[PDB]
Design a protein around this nucleic acid. Structure first.
Lengths: 92, 96, 79, 105, 92, 104, 97, 83
DNA sequence: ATCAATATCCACCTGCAGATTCTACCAAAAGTGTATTTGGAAACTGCTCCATCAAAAGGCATGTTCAGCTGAATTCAGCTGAACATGCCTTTTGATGGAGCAGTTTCCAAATACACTTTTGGTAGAATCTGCAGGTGGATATTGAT
DNA sequence: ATCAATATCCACCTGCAGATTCTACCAAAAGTGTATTTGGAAACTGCTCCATCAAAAGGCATGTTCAGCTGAATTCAGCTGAACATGCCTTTTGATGGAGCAGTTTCCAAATACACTTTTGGTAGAATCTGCAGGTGGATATTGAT
């Protein structure tokens, strides 16, 4: 019931700013952000796959979707951390 | 003692740009929302969060529109916003 | 009737946050009209969402979906 | 018996993202690497926003991030501002900006 | 190969304007129109089903989607012709 | 015998059904959905073709070209708002000159 | 020695080009431009004629719209002449900048 | 041959015609360069996304459908070229 | 305002080459007929969540006065942009060749989707903590006036 | 520049409403073992695509003149902002009922999954039309001059 991104946002927050806290409304905004970006990326990926007659969405689609969706260096840092997470996941 | 016109205007601008609270009163706004909604469907009932959401969206929309309006007034060599400005802003925006 | 409920000082505050220094007297009615049209569109789509769910209570999510449709995405009430 | 998130070195849940992808109706098939990659990007963007917002927080002498700090963070940074150009942040307010022509002289 | 709505558009054209013809570019634009509206409707319907946690798109979703997408009389005429087509289909 | 004929439609219901199933819109597709959708598409096609036919005739032409389509769309408010963010190739613009620019 | 007063031929041209639908930019320079930009994005890309055609239709449509918004901005400022200031205003209102 | 400074290929008369279709009566001399700048930004964005689509497809020809998908992304949907 | 004289639509005809309409066969949707699931509607129901109601308080709107400064109107000169005729070249456009592509088939090793059985992270309320929202009071800036 | 009159910070404090941590169920990944696609890795065409060629055209760049328009300057009446005194209603807080939710079970009418049987839409030549591109000729607008 009522699945949320709260714990993960709080984890990341504690990673970057160890004694910064976050209000409820702010957390809600963060949740909205996550869901929105999720749906943009996934949507664009879905269209990408559909254009090329592919029935599967690989990490490649996510990447091209990021290149299309995000602006500039935000996009290349996102692509780099995505590739990094994927390669590290593939290992063991 | 009396302040010159526009001084208090600038003061107010700084104040309300500094703050984030809702500017329209909640009860009249809720009454308005319920009127408009009733004419669409007759026995609708409303979440408090729904009225809150509507008020946030509305105030944001209006403020943005009013700064576009202000830009049109400044563009026309004027310091005062007029309905012609709002209409120009809304037609450039493509809202009509 | 209640559309006039939104007051001149309230619209004035909205103008202040928008960086407006001087306001014509004719502005307020135009502002009320605009707000009315905006709410008409948004509430129409939200209400549509409520009806399709065969519900009789408009939820925050209905408003959010409507806003998303209108190209006015909202965070913090979703969603 | 350890989660995919840890395997990817992430705080964001890869499994949950995977599920949301296949039940999402985006495609018949979801690649094994796709939810990892996406979770990574989400975690990164949240990270950037949260750091800049944290900075906004420190700057206004607060230890708890509120929506205003998020708004300041988003609008003061060009890229985030353009990513969310058509997005409204509740209780965020606006950036303090006054046109020069309105200023005294 | 390259399936098109050309034949159907031409049929409808001959119904409404029996001695009007149509150029290639005009027909192409018409195809773009049909596909565009198609994907807006189906998209909005998909979102509708997903919001209400339903895994199937019935004529109901299509109707609500039309009501959301189309303005005023366009919507009322579309809804009427849709409902009429569905009932006529169910009776035969 | 085809479903289009059963619904009294010119637009192919079957094709619409197929495209719904390939689209990824939902796990399942209702029997009534492709009928309803094909009906709405056929109607919108009809409306546009009527206004376009009118524009063509008004410019003394028997063959509809893109210009006629553009005239049709922009002169009708509802179609104009449906396709407000849409560009018609070789469609041109409506002839409109701001009053203040005319010579007097 | 006959000469039309300024703005007469302007209005005539406005009527002329508003009646017609043809592309106003010449095709070869536009193609050259598109291939340049694309090349500086990626060096081994090749272009369908239809791709450049699409780009030119989209671009001319866009520019024409922007220029009518610009014209409205000029008229609003009590002016008959469009200026870069007008384009800048139109583009910020549109949300392009 | 090397492609260089083709933005100037778009001429003052062409921009002027575009203005006439837009209903513009009088044009400041500074307009043409500004117009070129705008067109350049627009084409850069659209072609950037088209090219991205071509890259994802592992093709070396930008197709009309690539352009159309790109335009649709930018909120500038186009009819008449296959999409 | 007429007269007259440029240039300019504005119309109708006409012959004709380029598209449009029309005709004739074939892979691949579309439709049929049976065998299985299944999703979501119907039918009860336990609960958060909304709608009134009441009442007291003080937080703001309303209405009025009155003056300062803004916007609208007029005048007018400088110069910038329109109009035009010259002359020169870059674009058009109508075919030609060779080529480097997508586009198609034919298969497979790799990757993903299922079908059950287990193993934890996630989440929901209680049980502790903790900034911060207000609340004053005094130092500094801002403003308007001599 | 100084003088008074507000307004704005900035510091410093403290209880509390709301954030953080803490405790146990359980939905939902994760792990195992089988069952299916598929997206490429090579091998191969058939086609648009790039790049010329070669005249001719018409469209462009340039330079000159001048009219009309843009921006600067002034005037002034009008209106909107600053401030205040009054009173109205919106804001807070708490309670009460119940209405409209979701949450659970149960079970058909509806949808999915295969294997054949037909029909159709698409593609490629065959067989007509329709704007179009000119061509005067008839009214129209624009501009200069009585």
């Amino acid at each position: 019931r009522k699945e949320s991104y709260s714990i993960y946002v709080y984890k990341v927050l504690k990673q970057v700013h160890p004694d910064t806290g976050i209000s409820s409304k702010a957390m809600g905004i963060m949740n909205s952000f996550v869901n929105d970006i999720f749906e943009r990326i996934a949507g664009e990926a879905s269209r990408l796959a559909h254009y090329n007659k592919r029935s599967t969405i690989t990490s490649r689609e996510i990447q091209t979707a990021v290149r299309l969706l995000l602006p500039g260096e935000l996009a290349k840092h996102a692509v780099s951390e995505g590739t990094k997470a994927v390669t590290k996941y593939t290992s063991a | 003692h009396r302040y010159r016109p526009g001084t208090v205007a600038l003061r107010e601008i700084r104040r309300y740009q500094k703050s984030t609270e809702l500017l329209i009163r909640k009860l009249p706004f809720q009454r308005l929302v319920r009127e408009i909604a009733q004419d669409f469907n007759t026995d609708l009932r409303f979440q408090s969060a729904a009225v809150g959401a509507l008020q946030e969206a509305s105030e944001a929309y209006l403020v943005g529109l009013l700064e576009d309006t202000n830009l049109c007034a400044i563009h026309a060599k004027r310091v005062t916003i007029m309905p012609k400005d709002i209409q120009l802003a809304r037609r450039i925006r493509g809202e009509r | 009737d209640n559309i006039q409920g939104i007051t001149k000082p309230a619209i004035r505050r909205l103008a202040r946050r928008g960086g407006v220094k001087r306001i014509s007297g004719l502005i307020y009615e135009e502002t009320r009209g605009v707000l009315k049209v905006f709410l008409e569109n948004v509430i129409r789509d939200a209400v549509t969402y409520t009806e399709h769910a065969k519900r009789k209570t408009v939820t925050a999510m209905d408003v959010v979906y409507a806003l998303k449709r209108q190209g006015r995405t909202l965070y913090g009430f979703g969603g | 018996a350890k989660t995919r998130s840890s395997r990817a070195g992430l705080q964001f849940p890869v499994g949950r993202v995977h599920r949301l992808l296949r039940k999402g109706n985006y495609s018949e098939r979801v690649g094994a690497g796709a939810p990892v990659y996406l979770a990574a990007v989400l975690e990164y963007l949240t990270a950037e926003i949260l750091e800049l917002a944290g900075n906004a927080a420190r700057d206004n002498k607060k230890t708890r991030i509120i929506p205003r700090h998020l708004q300041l963070a988003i609008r003061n940074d060009e890229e985030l501002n353009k990513l969310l150009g058509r997005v409204t942040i509740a209780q965020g307010g606006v950036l303090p900006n006054i046109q020069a022509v309105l200023l005294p002289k």
